[PDB]
């Protein structure tokens, strides 16, 4: 998922 | 904390952009301002590796194609290749050695050293429309310095 600051956290398919 | 990633594009020190050359290859060429959307967008993850003030361990992937850049010994040659991965498992903090690049910033330019192959770098040729490859030097005629443009997210 995209957090509030624009980082993608976790694998590409969460 | 889970692995974090940012979206970005690469441009070599001679202003060449990076595009898909085929299903498992990247090539480098000058794109006109209107053709910039043909350039590949990388998913750059901050992975486990050596604790350094200079070297930042990263993995570079192509999300839409489920591919990661990886360094493997092909016969007698250290080789840059695009490898398919399961998107349910990748990216992760503990990326296998072949996927790890040490991102180093020098005179405001970036170099990507293979962790698997120290002193080998993501490289482009000076010539137009040539593949992106793993080069055994940050010196010589080949290009190993890039600028990164982050993509809104």
UniProtKB/Swiss-Prot annotation, chain B:
GO biological process, one term: neutrophil chemotaxis
GO CC, one annotated term: extracellular region
Induction comment: By LPS. Transcription and translation induced by M.tuberculosis and a number of different M.tuberculosis components in macrophages; EsxA is the most potent activator tested (at protein level). In pancreatic islets, release is increased by high glucose treatment. In pancreatic islets and macrophages, release is also increased by endocannabinoid anandamide/AEA.
Swiss-Prot/TrEMBL site (Involved in receptor binding) positions: 4
Assembly and oligomerization: Monomer. In its precursor form, weakly interacts with full-length MEFV; the mature cytokine does not interact at all. Interacts with integrins ITGAV:ITGBV and ITGA5:ITGB1; integrin-binding is required for IL1B signaling. Interacts with cargo receptor TMED10; the interaction is direct and is required for the secretion of IL1B mature form. Interacts with HSP90AB1; the interaction facilitates cargo translocation into the ERGIC. Interacts with HSP90B1; the interaction facilitates cargo translocation into the ERGIC.
The keyword Cytoplasm belongs to this UniProt entry's keyword annotation: yes
Keyword field: Cytokine, Cytoplasm, Inflammatory response, Lysosome, Mitogen, Pyrogen, Secreted
Gene Ontology molecular-function annotations: cytokine activity; integrin binding; interleukin-1 receptor binding; protein domain specific binding
Reported impact of residue 74 to E: Suppression of integrin binding. Markedly reduced activity. Markedly reduced activity
Coverage span on the entire protein: 117 to 269 of 269
Site features described as Important for interaction with integrin, chain residue numbers: 55, 63, 65, 74, 88
Provenance organism: Homo sapiens
Protein name: Interleukin-1 beta
Tissue: Expressed in activated monocytes/macrophages (at protein level).
Motif (Involved in interaction with TMED10 C-terminus): 112-125
Resulting phenotype, residue 25 to N: Requires 2 nucleotide substitutions
Chief site of localization: cytoplasm
Result, substituting residue 65 to E: Suppression of integrin binding. Markedly reduced activity
Family stated for the protein in its record: Belongs to the IL-1 family.
Lineage: Eukaryota, Metazoa, Chordata, Craniata, Vertebrata
Post-translational modification summary for this protein: Activation of the IL1B precursor involves a CASP1-catalyzed proteolytic cleavage. Processing and secretion are temporarily associated. (Microbial infection) Cleavage by S.pyogenes cysteine protease SpeB promotes its activation independently of CASP1.
Regulation: (Microbial infection) Cleavage by S.pyogenes cysteine protease SpeB promotes its activation independently of CASP1. SpeB-mediated maturation of IL1B plays a dual role depending on infection site: while IL1B inflammatory response prevents bacterial growth during invasive skin infections, it promotes streptococcal infection of the nasopharynx by disrupting colonization resistance mediated by the microbiota.
Job of this protein: Potent pro-inflammatory cytokine. Initially discovered as the major endogenous pyrogen, induces prostaglandin synthesis, neutrophil influx and activation, T-cell activation and cytokine production, B-cell activation and antibody production, and fibroblast proliferation and collagen production. Promotes Th17 differentiation of T-cells. Synergizes with IL12/interleukin-12 to induce IFNG synthesis from T-helper 1 (Th1) cells. Plays a role in angiogenesis by inducing VEGF production synergistically with TNF and IL6.
Miscellaneous field: The IL1B production occurs in 2 steps, each being controlled by different stimuli. First, inflammatory signals, such as LPS, stimulate the synthesis and promote the accumulation of cytosolic stores of pro-IL1B (priming). Then additional signals are required for inflammasome assembly, leading to CASP1 activation, pro-IL1B processing and eventually secretion of the active cytokine. IL1B processing and secretion are temporarily associated.
């Amino acid at each position: 998922f995209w957090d509030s600051w624009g980082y993608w956290y976790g694998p590409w398919d969460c | 904390a889970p692995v974090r990633s940012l979206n970005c594009t690469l441009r070599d020190s001679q202003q060449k952009s990076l595009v898909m050359s085929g299903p498992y290859e990247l090539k480098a060429l000058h794109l006109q301002g209107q053709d910039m959307e043909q350039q590949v967008v990388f998913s750059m993850s901050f992975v486990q590796g050596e604790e350094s003030n200079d070297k930042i361990p990263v993995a570079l992937g192509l999300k839409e194609k489920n591919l990661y850049l990886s360094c493997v010994l092909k016969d007698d040659k250290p080789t840059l290749q695009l490898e398919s991965v399961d998107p349910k498992n990748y990216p992760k903090k503990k990326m296998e050695k072949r996927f790890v690049f040490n991102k180093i910033e020098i005179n405001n330019k970036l170099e990507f050293e293979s962790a698997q192959f120290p002193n080998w770098y993501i490289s482009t040729s000076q010539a137009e429309n040539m593949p992106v490859f793993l080069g055994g030097t940050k010196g010589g005629q080949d290009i190993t310095d890039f600028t990164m443009q982050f993509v809104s997210s």
